[PDB]
Design a protein around this ligand. Structure first.
Ligand SMILES: [Mg+2]
Ligand SMILES: [Mg+2]
Ligand SMILES: [Mg+2]
Ligand SMILES: [Mg+2]
Ligand SMILES: [Mg+2]
Ligand SMILES: [Mg+2]
Ligand SMILES: [Mg+2]
Ligand SMILES: [Mg+2]
Ligand SMILES: [Mg+2]
Ligand SMILES: [Mg+2]
Ligand SMILES: [Mg+2]
Ligand SMILES: [Mg+2]
Ligand SMILES: [Mg+2]
Ligand SMILES: [Mg+2]
Ligand SMILES: [Mg+2]
Ligand SMILES: [Mg+2]
Ligand SMILES: [Mg+2]
Ligand SMILES: [Mg+2]
Ligand SMILES: [Mg+2]
Ligand SMILES: [Mg+2]
Ligand SMILES: [Mg+2]
Ligand SMILES: [Mg+2]
Ligand SMILES: [Mg+2]
Ligand SMILES: [Mg+2]
Ligand SMILES: [Mg+2]
Ligand SMILES: [Mg+2]
Ligand SMILES: [Mg+2]
Ligand SMILES: [Mg+2]
Ligand SMILES: [Mg+2]
Ligand SMILES: [Mg+2]
Ligand SMILES: [Mg+2]
Ligand SMILES: [Mg+2]
Ligand SMILES: [Mg+2]
Ligand SMILES: [Mg+2]
Ligand SMILES: [Mg+2]
Ligand SMILES: [Mg+2]
Ligand SMILES: [Mg+2]
Ligand SMILES: [Mg+2]
Ligand SMILES: [Mg+2]
Ligand SMILES: [Mg+2]
Ligand SMILES: [Mg+2]
Ligand SMILES: [Mg+2]
Ligand SMILES: [Mg+2]
Ligand SMILES: [Mg+2]
Lengths: 138, 128, 150
RNA sequence: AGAAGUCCAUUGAACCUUAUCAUUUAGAGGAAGCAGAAGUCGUAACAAGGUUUCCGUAGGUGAACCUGCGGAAGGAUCAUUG
RNA sequence: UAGGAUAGGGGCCUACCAUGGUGGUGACGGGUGACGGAGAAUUAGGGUUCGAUUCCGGAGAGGGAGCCUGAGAAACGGCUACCACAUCCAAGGAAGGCAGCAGGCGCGCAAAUUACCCAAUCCUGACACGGGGAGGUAGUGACAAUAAAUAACAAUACCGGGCGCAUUAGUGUCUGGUAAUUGGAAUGAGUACAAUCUAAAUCCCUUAACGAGGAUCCAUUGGAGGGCAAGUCUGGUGCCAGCAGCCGCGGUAAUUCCAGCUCCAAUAGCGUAUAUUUAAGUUGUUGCAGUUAAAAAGCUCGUAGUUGGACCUUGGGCCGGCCGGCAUCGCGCUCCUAGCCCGGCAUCGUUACUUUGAAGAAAUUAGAGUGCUCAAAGCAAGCCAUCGCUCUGGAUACAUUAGCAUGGGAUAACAUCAUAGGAUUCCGGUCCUAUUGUGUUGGCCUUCGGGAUCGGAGUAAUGAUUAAUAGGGACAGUCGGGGGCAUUCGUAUUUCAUAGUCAGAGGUGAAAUUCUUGGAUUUAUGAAAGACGAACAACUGCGAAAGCAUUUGCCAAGGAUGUUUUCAUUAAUCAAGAACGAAAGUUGGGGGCUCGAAGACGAUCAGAUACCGUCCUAGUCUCAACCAUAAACGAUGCCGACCAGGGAUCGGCGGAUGUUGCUUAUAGGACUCCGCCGGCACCUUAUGAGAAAUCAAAGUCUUUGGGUUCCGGGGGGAGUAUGGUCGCAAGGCUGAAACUUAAAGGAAUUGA
């Protein structure tokens, strides 16, 4: 059972200190490996498109998910970013600047796309939203 | 392995919950008697007797059938006249009835007499 | 329960309500004092002395007859042992066990029991140093322990 | 009164040699784990799963696995006075 | 210790000397994408996270270092030197420091004008006057925050429901409306004379004149399967393209994609990414769990740590209207306060706790007052005859911990009356200081005061709580397959011997390998060897667990019972540390019956590196030394209390008449009945608990708090990598991360 002594404050406080490391969220935020990730603790990052690849969807689905492999400017890492909309892959060209964000779920893959946790949100300084909705052109 | 005023109060809850009319507390002390006086003066038990064969002691209590739960706060916290309110919200069923027992340099007494006499102390238990 | 087992027996003595000596006990405090000192000088510790006075001379308890515990009687007359009684007997048992152990080195049950008895000796010696019934320098040698007793 | 220069001290940047730490970076070769997909070989487990299953240890084999020793029931027996 | 230096204390530094100082209450080291605080976000309460930034404190001016001037600097809008970088050159030389304001490059997801002014607030100089990129003003500015447009009203109308006839109608009620229907009234968005604003301008507030028919003065962002509010509408596409936080949608009839219409939510705003709080009682002090879902160490000992039984008056009264002031059987006062002989006095145990007070920066928070037109704000303002000015305000509170002071003395700590070295109304003695009798100064000392030593008469109620259904120790008769050493025995198995017999024996579902007329298997007597200890033998015993079963002897140990013996709190649980720890395994001797990993064969089979059969090596046994693990299981740590009924059973004890193939009679042993302690368990039952299975402890839990140790936080990766440590080795202990994944899992139900 729990220690209950009046003079037990050290035991309780040190015990909580030790046991908090068993919690995945605490350990994820207090261990430092987020600075080793592609974005290095950033919401967005700019990159240069290296190639367009295209990835299959997992078993219950069947489709080709069209993604662009990007190189991050700040650190030179290489990632794959989904291009969200119908026909927006044709806006992407080779060696153009692109603004990438997370997919949601904070670094964990979304939906049926295997091993992709990044999404393309801007190309050539112009939104994919404005290009898909014809508000602006590049 | 003993720290009395827990065995006494828990023996009383068990006996009252079975509907017994007499309960017997083997090890007694002045603290237990002082607590039982508050119980009686607020009306939750009938009269009780000390049986001294010689030793620590022994008492028998007469149960009136109106007590619902009486327990101890072991790890007796330090309790000033301003945080009485928050203990009684954490520990009593309502603002209308129930008592927290505090030991104070002015004796053992319930929290309401403590408010009137403006003294804090250390919490011993509660009953309601 | 027991300090060094799982036994939970409650067998022990129960003194009566009545503090005063019984009606039929006619012996005077000085004669009982004399019996206690006589048995003590013969080498009997307070437990054996109490057993004697219970059994032969019809003394239920000395503290009821004379008003003073038998150890206090032995102390006032300068006859209490130097090593308290329970520690004396623990030391003697530890010596007996160790003597048995050098003759049976693969008897691991007695090795376990020797550890238990030395543990009890150390705990009682801690008590005795704390309460000034032993020198604050008394310490227990496995080697030179038979010289002290028997 | 007194400048240049100079002598010994003192604070001491900076550079060098070895050692050492700490952090990032290459590698012949090896060996893992994962995910995926209509490949191959068997049938290990779930029924007494067709040799009850499993735990520790030790050896052996394409693979699952097999065997010896001791243990458990989470067993397929809460049961012999019949 | 003595110096030197400094404005000054100080190993600050020098000489000499001593050997210390910090550390499981975490030193030293490492990380910090770490300046500290006031504070910020979220907050039922408790908490969690943040704090570069305008206030306070510190630090730096490319990196170090050294300085001059000066009251003040180790200054950088000062100097000197070096390192890094870099500029002008007439090639000898010269000058550098934007983490000031604006601006530029670079870095980036990420941040404004190379503007005006000292007019406000203040600083500064010789100074009322100069100066101020401090500071203000304007500009850019959907960072956040406040208020608040995009329409109101009328009758018409195809109509649409209640309410008037409610019959049978029909329309008329608040108008609910597709109505680009008809009709005027209203207004500020915009524009702009003017005044006002301002340092000069500008914006706002006033304002002349303009300025509204609904196509415009035109509202967006996200959605419409579920969660979650809103379409089983219409085209397209056909597991494609695509959507989808999650579950999922899409494979020719898509409520989910691409679009239209329509509807939904918020609305001048809304979506997305990342971080963080809430949800999260999924970090649990309040407040979670650990039989089976993740999770009690194999077991016991043990130091620190945490926890700790009962006991020593404020009890019996007066007193005035919750408390003062007394009195009972209240250890004293010279000195401070000191009533008209009189309360309420100070040092001859400390703390925690609690009460009250002081001293605590502002801003922020809470909060009193006040109509900036409301609000976010701000600290103002309100009245006068809104006439030679009146009344003013600019509160108050919170502030954990530490420090200061005050009352209380229950609760709990730590220190402590058995060596009386105790207190004590009094007596002088070893000895010194010296006052008012020295109007002066003092100066050894007579009654006198004080330490303090001090031999004794003094008085007194003369001074040690009890003996825990806490613990230890002693004693008594016992009990046990508890341990160790020696010793006794048993049949069986294998081998051999001796004798008899002749064809098979073995093994299997069936066979084969194997043995066999040098007689196998069988029978009989005996010997040797090594292992094992059947039956009795159990919902039985003993042990800390692992474990322990032939006899007898010896050695020490142990629980329970009994007790009018003893000590007196000595105790519970436990980091460090330590003993023991099945089997297998390792090294070396001994042994070597049986069985038997490996191996060799025989079968079976599609194969059979297996199951089955035969022969067997290590091993199994023993000694010395290692190893330290098991489903080491009751998958349930230990100590304590309470809580239900019953019958058995083992140990001990007590009480019963009634019988023994017992016993000079009895007692006792065997049996029967009753009771009390202590064990191993079992049966029935909820008034209980639980997800249930189940459990009389897994109960006494949202009505949550007896004490303590270990340990869990979705599934994997993984008991893996790495470092340390132990081991001869096998391995043991300690023990991650990347990555991956939407379930894995427990109990029970219905089916198959
Ligand atoms: Mg989590
Ligand atoms: Mg007990
Ligand atoms: Mg113990
Ligand atoms: Mg297959
Ligand atoms: Mg197949
Ligand atoms: Mg198998
Ligand atoms: Mg199978
Ligand atoms: Mg099988
Ligand atoms: Mg099975
Ligand atoms: Mg094999
Ligand atoms: Mg000095
Ligand atoms: Mg920093
Ligand atoms: Mg920074
Ligand atoms: Mg500052
Ligand atoms: Mg400076
Ligand atoms: Mg710079
Ligand atoms: Mg400088
Ligand atoms: Mg500058
Ligand atoms: Mg600048
Ligand atoms: Mg829309
Ligand atoms: Mg949509
Ligand atoms: Mg929805
Ligand atoms: Mg709905
Ligand atoms: Mg989304
Ligand atoms: Mg799914
Ligand atoms: Mg949807
Ligand atoms: Mg749609
Ligand atoms: Mg949980
Ligand atoms: Mg399991
Ligand atoms: Mg489990
Ligand atoms: Mg301890
Ligand atoms: Mg006792
Ligand atoms: Mg023959
Ligand atoms: Mg038996
Ligand atoms: Mg036998
Ligand atoms: Mg084989
Ligand atoms: Mg284990
Ligand atoms: Mg376990
Ligand atoms: Mg266990
Ligand atoms: Mg019996
Ligand atoms: Mg019993
Ligand atoms: Mg979790
Ligand atoms: Mg986990
Ligand atoms: Mg199941």
């Amino acid at each position: 059972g729990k220690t209950r002594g009046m003079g037990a404050g050290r035991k309780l406080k040190t015990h909580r200190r030790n046991q908090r490391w068993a919690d995945k969220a605490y350990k994820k935020s207090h261990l430092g490996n987020e600075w080793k990730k592609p974005f290095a603790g950033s919401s967005h990052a700019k990159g240069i498109v290296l190639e367009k690849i295209g990835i299959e969807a997992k078993q219950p689905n069947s489709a080709i998910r069209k993604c662009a492999r990007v190189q991050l400017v700040k650190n030179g890492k290489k990632i794959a970013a989904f291009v969200p909309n119908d026909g927006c892959l044709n806006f992407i060209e080779e060696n153009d600047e692109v603004l990438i964000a997370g997919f949601g779920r904070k670094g964990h893959a979304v939906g049926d796309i295997p091993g992709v946790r990044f999404k393309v949100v801007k190309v050539s300084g112009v939104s994919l939203l404005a290009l898909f909705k014809e508000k602006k052109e590049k | 392995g003993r720290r009395i005023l827990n065995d006494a109060l828990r023996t009383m809850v068990n006996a009252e919950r079975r509907g017994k009319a007499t309960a017997q507390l083997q090890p007694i002390s002045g603290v237990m008697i002082s607590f039982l006086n508050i119980m009686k003066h607020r009306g939750y038990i009938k009269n009780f007797e000390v049986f001294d064969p010689h030793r620590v002691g022994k008492i028998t209590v007469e149960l009136q059938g109106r007590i619902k739960d009486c327990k101890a706060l072991t790890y007796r916290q330090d309790l000033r006249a301003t945080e009485i309110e928050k203990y009684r919200t954490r520990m009593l069923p309502t603002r209308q009835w129930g008592y927290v027992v505090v030991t104070t340099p002015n004796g053992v007494l319930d929290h309401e007499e403590a408010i009137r006499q403006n003294v804090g102390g250390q919490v011993l238990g509660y009953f309601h | 329960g027991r300090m060094h087992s799982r036994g939970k027996g409650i067998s022990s003595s129960a003194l009566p309500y009545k503090r005063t000596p019984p009606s039929w006990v006619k012996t005077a405090v000085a004669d009982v004092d004399e019996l206690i000192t006589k048995a003590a000088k013969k080498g009997q510790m307070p437990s054996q002395i109490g057993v004697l006075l219970r059994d032969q001379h019809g003394i239920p308890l000395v503290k009821s007859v004379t008003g003073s515990k038998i150890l206090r009687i032995l102390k006032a007359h300068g006859l209490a042992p130097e090593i308290p009684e329970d520690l004396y007997f623990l030391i003697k048992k530890a010596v007996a066990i160790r003597k048995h152990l050098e003759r049976n080195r693969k008897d691991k049950d007695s090795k376990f029991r020797l550890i238990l008895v030395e543990s009890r000796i150390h705990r009682l010696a801690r008590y005795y140093k704390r309460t000034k019934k032993l020198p604050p320098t008394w310490k227990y040698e496995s080697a030179t322990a038979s010289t002290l007793v028997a």
